[PDB]
Design a protein around this ligand. Structure first.
Ligand SMILES: [Zn+2]
Lengths: 232, 291, 232, 289
């Protein structure tokens, strides 16, 4: 991984730059491949103004992939925090308020503890200390209860979002696959490239919905990095 | 409450008596006084010491060892001051590495064979005495220690023999810990003296047994000097004045459901049979002057 | 995962067996694919008795892949334990013996501590307690030292074995690639199957050494599970 | 060794003094007895106390609040018997939620504002008083707590972040002002019984486990036998008090100093009565023993 301990063990043995140069040329094909998918997405986007619904389905999936990028796997539950600071009919938020109320009596008796004297109220000293370790055990019982419920709620809503994400990531390819989305100009692409359409059953000469599924995330991704120039 | 230990005498179902605290209080005097006062109305009472102060010899001018016997003047006084280091002398190499694996192993095995020697005979009751608390109180955790030991060796000469030996230690210590929480035959007393820290670590011990589920009802104090009529030492007056200040706070807590045993310091380190009888007699009839 | 809480949340919404049946047919292709690799391994095994050295190279690589299966990533260092309980010229095992020697003085002074009395030798009490926490700090310093050296030695020898593993996993395909390993009978396989030989530059009608690299691990793997019947 | 505190006297570059221990010893009377002969040769000495017993009310019959002042009969006695719970009074929802992960917040803020007011002026030396030890020396963790406070977060938010950064650099320089050993000292107290010797011994290696030495140990209530007159209690009490007293003579008499302070009749109150008690810390009275 470091390419330094591998050189520290390369001394034990006694060509390599030929494969080193021969490997790096292959990435040019995939970068210009994504650049031509960028140009065909530009020409697909111009054709809608002068002239359907599935493109808007991809339009919503772009904001889904954006939230996939600017995901806070904790901050989604930070939205769930104000989600559950709202409902008064919540059973759990009632005990959450009782938790904060007990925290108020905790800090209150701790103030009365340190305010008290260890000389002439030693009986009240011990009664405070007993109430102190009385409440100290029930404190983290709620930390075991509610944070358990919270991480289970996260495990629910991860899949609850994941269904809405990958259901559209596999339905688009299930249905409306043979039905051609649009027809490529005759003669622009070699025969072997057109084959891509043939494998999902769509008629030869039209495009499928994959590069629209996966690589359109890169299309807004540069606009995502445009926002990286906006704030920073 | 009733300022005596008469309720300790009255329950015939009692079997085990625990007595302790911290240093500087003379627990041995309380121990032998409790033993001899128990011998008035009991059948077969055995004392046992593990504190390295070999004090019962000084209590009776007679050497004792690793075997019980009857001492003179009594038909019920049996004791054997033993050492915890004898089991490690029995270890005197892999078991030393096991003793490195967990900070305590051999002391529990010594305690176990001690209790097997205890339950070998048909004795009525016994009593105890211990060191400072951080090395004392791990004997309650000896079942959890042996649980860790068997969980360790279950992953780790014949090993089946020490497996069956540790299983016998497991079931024996489970019967002992089960007998601990029954509370109809196991009691515990603690001692202290009128100053700050002596009173301080006392409630720490009480809340310790509170988080292990063993109550008590009796707490003894020591050296409570009451003034002689007429005669006075001028520094003794101020010592008594400050002594009452810490005394009344112990009244301010434990007068609800505990007992207070007033015991004055005598002029001599009380030895001899008859002197220990007179010293023990005050734990039934409480002396009270007008104060 | 359970397909029961997923049905408990399927009630919130209001086809599915079409994808359920369409997915299950794909595994037939991979099972008959492994059955034809089984038949080609049978015909490759028959060709050696009537007939070389690179088959013995694969023979050693089979025991390498076996150790890859019955790998103990700790138990390799369990071999390293008796590897380093041997050399008397080792610098580290010298301090390991000094560690066990200090452990002997530790348990010795701890015995003299608990054997001692807290009343009338309080100066010796404190001198023992000071020597106790004196040695207690130097105890885990060696646990930080030697176990660090041990995990670094493991990280060295993982790659030291990995070179001997993947060097034979790629050299074989580098050299002796165009040079044909053996010739397929004329007419048994369709032209498209012969495609595999054509890509590594080996002449059409002969085979290369891939299925011998990866799928021969399955050949002894059933014999590996034969050992699962031997002990159990 | 030397039975006095002369090394504390002629140093004159000291700035910080830590004196505590355990209760029932009258350590505040020892601190005032130290400070009296402290100011006899000095210029600007300030007392600070934080124990909930307001012992300086008993010491001078004059109430001290949250501001320094001077009491009569002196030109240098300055003290303010403040409480740390005023910082809790200063905290009377996220800030109150911050008490969960770290149970100690207001004590570090109290040491902030107090030591800021201390280092505001140019006083020569200060004196201190503390709670029991496990609640005392947890203040040494304040650089660690503020370390993780700055790690917790790392314009209503960043301004307090810069304020806590100023608290960070201030507490880092004051902790750098601690291990210098030419201005920061420590004296512990004890009494002749078992447990006081026990927890004092437990206290010493804690400052050894933080890299702070000591050289001065004070004992208290050392009873002396009366010639001619005799009490039968005091004989055996003298025996028991000797028994531990000789045990400490095997302990510390090669690199520590032993202070003999005998008990008196009453709690010594008032300035002129306290002066004779404060006299014994330099000229140690010694009967023939
Ligand atoms: Zn007297």
């Amino acid at each position: 991984v470091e390419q330094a301990i591998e050189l520290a063990l390369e001394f034990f043995p006694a060509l390599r730059p030929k494969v080193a140069v021969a490997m790096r040329y292959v990435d040019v094909g995939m970068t210009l491949w994504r650049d031509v998918m960028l140009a065909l997405f530009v020409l697909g986007a111009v054709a809608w103004w002068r002239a359907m619904s599935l493109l808007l389905v991809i339009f919503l999936l772009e904001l889904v992939v954006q939230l996939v990028n600017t995901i806070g796997a904790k901050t989604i539950n930070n939205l769930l925090w104000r989600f559950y600071l709202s409902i008064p009919g919540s059973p759990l938020a009632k005990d959450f308020a009782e938790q904060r109320a007990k925290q108020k009596e905790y800090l209150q008796v701790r103030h009365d503890l340190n305010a008290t004297s260890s000389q002439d109220e030693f009986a009240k000293w011990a009664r405070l200390q007993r109430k102190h370790d009385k409440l100290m055990d029930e404190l983290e019982k709620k930390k075991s209860q509610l944070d358990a419920h919270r991480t289970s709620f996260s495990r629910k809503l991860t899949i609850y979002r994941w269904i809405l994400t990958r259901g559209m990531q596999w339905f688009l390819c299930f249905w409306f696959s043979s039905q051609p989305m649009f027809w490529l100009p005759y003669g622009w692409f070699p025969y072997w490239v057109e084959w891509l359409v043939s494998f999902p059953n769509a008629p030869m000469g039209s495009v499928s919905i994959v590069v629209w599924q996966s690589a359109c995330s890169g299309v807004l991704a540069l606009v995502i990095e445009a926002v990286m120039a906006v704030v920073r | 409450m009733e300022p005596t230990l008469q309720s300790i005498l009255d329950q015939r179902s009692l079997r085990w008596i625990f007595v302790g605290g911290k240093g500087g209080v003379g627990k041995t005097t309380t121990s032998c006084s409790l033993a001899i006062q128990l011998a008035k109305v009991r059948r077969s009472v055995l004392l046992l010491s593990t504190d390295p102060a070999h004090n019962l010899s000084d209590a009776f001018s007679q050497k004792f060892g690793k075997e019980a016997r009857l001492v003179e003047g009594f038909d019920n006084l049996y004791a054997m001051e033993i050492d915890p280091n004898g089991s490690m002398q029995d270890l005197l190499g892999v078991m030393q590495d096991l003793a490195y694996a967990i900070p305590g192993i051999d002391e529990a095995m010594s305690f176990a064979e001690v209790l097997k020697q205890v339950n070998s005979l048909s004795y009525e009751t016994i009593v105890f005495d211990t060191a400072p608390t951080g090395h004392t109180l791990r004997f309650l955790q000896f079942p959890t220690v042996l649980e860790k030991a068997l969980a360790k060796v279950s992953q780790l000469q014949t090993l089946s023999d020490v497996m069956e030996k540790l299983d016998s230690l497991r079931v024996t210590i489970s019967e002992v810990n089960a007998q601990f929480k029954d509370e109809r035959l196991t009691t515990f007393v603690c001692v202290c003296i009128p100053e700050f820290l002596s009173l301080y670590e006392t409630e720490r011990m009480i809340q310790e047994l509170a988080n292990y589920g063993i109550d008590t009802h009796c707490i003894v104090v020591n050296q409570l000097l009451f003034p002689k009529p007429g005669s006075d030492c001028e520094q003794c007056t101020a010592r008594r004045r400050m002594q009452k200040k810490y005394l009344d706070q112990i009244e301010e807590l434990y007068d609800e459901e505990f007992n207070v045993v007033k015991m004055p310091l005598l002029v001599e380190e009380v030895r001899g049979k008859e002197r220990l009888e007179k010293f023990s007699e005050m734990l039934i009839k409480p002396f009270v002057p007008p104060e």
